[PDB]
Every structure is written in structure tokens, then in C-alpha cells.
Design a protein around this ligand. Structure first.
Ligand SMILES: */C=C/C(=O)N1CCC[C@@H](n2nc(-c3cn(C)c4ccccc34)c3c(N)ncnc32)C1
Length: 291
């Protein structure tokens, strides 16, 4: 059947890392920016640390550990992996710090300076991350611009395997109707995610109640063509929102298409002004040292 999962789960003693600031608090919990110093090594690694807000329930610890399980089992340049856990009364997850936050906020905040080259590269990178998950027989279930993190403006990675094996406006039709989720189901979400980026962060089907969404899609309605998108790009989004799940593109195909478009980006996205667009600190991606 499946091959054994020999990923290592690293345990971090609370004294090897320090919380420095809060980055955000929500339903998810509290996320801090911090610094990790592996014991006896002259390295400081920028990290983010996640604590579950204001509780110590047995159900809450179960889901945190499920998340850690999935994050420990991946290794790809466009996916977020776990650095370790800290076994504190409140169990903490430690991962690499992604300084620019999520891609959704980044596109919103930084829109007047985002060119076609960045947009299409993000699309490739996400498709690469997703393709890697598919290789791992892993269905995401919550792909969205809010779940892509930004290491640098040139380098993004997929995250939030909380649901990874509701966010209704990102879901394939078959998922809404029948709670079915597949890799092809993730493509639909990929399509919505691309639309988000191309609209610089608009909310899809804005001011429409989620109950209505199933009905709209059944008729044949889809998200509108964004103003910067040539028909070439929008057609790709539309193919991801095809009713027959097998008619949708494969992640591997999307890597290819978007990648071709990234070679001549101004031919596929039309954006006004597009032309005019600590001594021992080591990034987690360069720190491959065991135990
Ligand atoms: C758009 C997402 C957003 O608004 N966030 C709120 C601000 C903090 C953001 N954030 N989350 C993580 C993150 C995600 N996951 C799965 C983990 C797991 C362990 C520790 C952090 C963390 C962030 C990271 N790594 N860096 C910077 N911001 C992060 C989410």
C-alpha cells in the first residue's frame, strides 16, 4: 500500500527559541515572530511560532498535532514545512518565518507596484507546490491566496494543511454538493486563487451569501474576467472551473502554461505602468542540520 513515513519530528526545548513580536491573532491562534538558536551551533534562524489562543482543550491539542504531522512530512521549495514542536502546556508549532506575510495581504497592500512578471511567477510557484502535494498523494482542501506565504517577493510557498488530508467560495462544485475532495478539486481552488491574485485581492462573488453559490455554479456562472487578463490567462482560470473534474487541467500542465507565459509576461497580462515596476542569521532553508 503506502510507503512508510520516516519523517523526523523535531522537539524544541523552550529555551532554544525566543518570541519577539506578535504577527497576528485569530480563530487560528497566536503567531509570533521569533528567533531559534539550535543548541551548540552558532546560528540564529528566523522563525514564526504558533500558539493556540486562550485554551488547553484535548481536542485543540489533537488538531495542532495533526497539523504538525502533515507539515513534518513535506519537503519542497514551494511548500511550508515544520521546523519543530515545543511541548509546552500550550503546544507550539515552529516554522520558518515568512516575512512578507500571506500573498493575499501582500497583493492588496502592494498592488500599485506588482508587475506581470511577479504575478505569473507566483502562479508557477503555486502550481509547483500543488504538484508536489499531488505527488505525495496529498489533497490540500484549503488552497487560497490567504494560505500562500511570502518568503520574499520572488518566492512564495503553500501552507495551511490544517484541513490537509467551510471555505465555500474556493470550493469545487462536487465538494459543495457531495463533500468530495480530490487533486482536481484543488485545481478549482487554484483557479480561484489565481483570480484573487489577478484582481489584486478582491473577494470572489463579493457580497453574495455562501448558500447561493452552489446554485450560481450549477447554471454556468463563474468569476468575471479580471481587467488585466488576456483571454489566454482567463481561459486557464475557466478550465479550472469546469464541471467535469477530469476536464480540468493538471497541476503539471498549469506549471507549463504559466511558465510559458512568464517568458513574455506583457503579452499575457496588461497592467498600466508594468514597465516601471545579525552576524549569524541563517535562513531556515539553508539550515539542514539534524538533531
Ligand atoms: C494572510 C495570512 C495571515 O493573515 N496570517 C496572519 C498573520 C500571521 C500569518 N502567518 N502564519 C504563519 C504560519 C502559518 N503556519 C501554518 C504556521 C505554523 C507555525 C508557525 C507559523 C505559521 C506565518 C509565518 N510562518 N510567518 C509569517 N506569518 C505567518 C498568517
Amino acid at each position: 500500500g503506502e510507503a512508510p513515513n520516516q519523517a523526523l519530528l523535531r522537539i524544541l526545548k523552550e529555551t532554544e527559541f525566543k518570541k519577539i513580536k506578535v504577527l497576528g491573532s485569530g480563530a487560528f491562534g497566536t503567531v509570533y515572530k521569533g528567533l531559534w538558536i539550535p543548541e551548540g551551533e552558532k546560528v540564529k534562524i528566523p522563525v514564526a511560532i504558533k500558539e493556540l489562543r486562550e485554551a488547553t482543550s484535548p481536542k485543540a491539542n489533537k488538531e495542532i498535532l495533526d497539523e504538525a504531522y502533515v507539515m513534518a512530512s513535506v519537503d519542497n521549495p514551494h511548500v511550508c514545512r515544520l521546523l519543530g514542536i515545543c511541548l509546552t502546556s500550550t503546544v507550539q508549532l515552529i516554522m520558518q518565518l515568512m516575512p512578507f506575510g500571506c500573498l493575499l495581504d501582500y497583493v492588496r497592500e502592494h498592488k500599485d507596484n506588482i508587475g506581470s512578471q511577479y504575478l505569473l511567477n507566483w502562479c508557477v510557484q503555486i502550481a509547483k507546490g500543488m504538484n508536489y502535494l499531488e505527488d505525495r498523494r496529498l489533497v490540500h482542501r484549503d488552497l487560497a491566496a490567504r494560505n500562500v506565504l511570502v518568503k520574499t517577493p520572488q518566492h512564495v510557498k503553500i501552507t495551511d494543511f490544517g484541513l490537509a488530508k467551510v471555505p465555500i467560495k474556493w470550493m469545487a462544485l462536487e465538494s459543495i454538493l457531495h463533500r468530495i475532495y480530490t487533486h482536481q478539486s484543488d485545481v478549482w481552488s487554484y483557479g480561484v486563487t489565481v483570480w484573487e491574485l489577478m484582481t489584486f485581492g478582491s473577494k470572489p462573488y463579493d457580497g453574495i451569501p455562501a448558500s447561493e453559490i452552489s446554485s450560481i455554479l450549477e447554471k454556468g456562472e463563474r468569476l468575471p474576467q479580471p481587467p488585466i487578463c488576456t483571454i489566454d490567462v482567463y481561459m486557464i482560470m475557466v478550465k479550472c472551473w469546469m464541471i467535469d473534474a477530469d476536464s480540468r487541467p493538471k497541476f503539471r500542465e498549469l506549471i507549463i502554461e504559466f511558465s510559458k507565459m512568464a517568458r513574455d509576461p506583457q503579452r499575457y497580462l496588461v497592467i498600466q505602468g508594468d514597465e516601471r515596476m545579525m552576524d549569524d542569521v541563517v535562513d531556515a532553508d539553508e539550515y539542514l542540520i539534524p538533531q
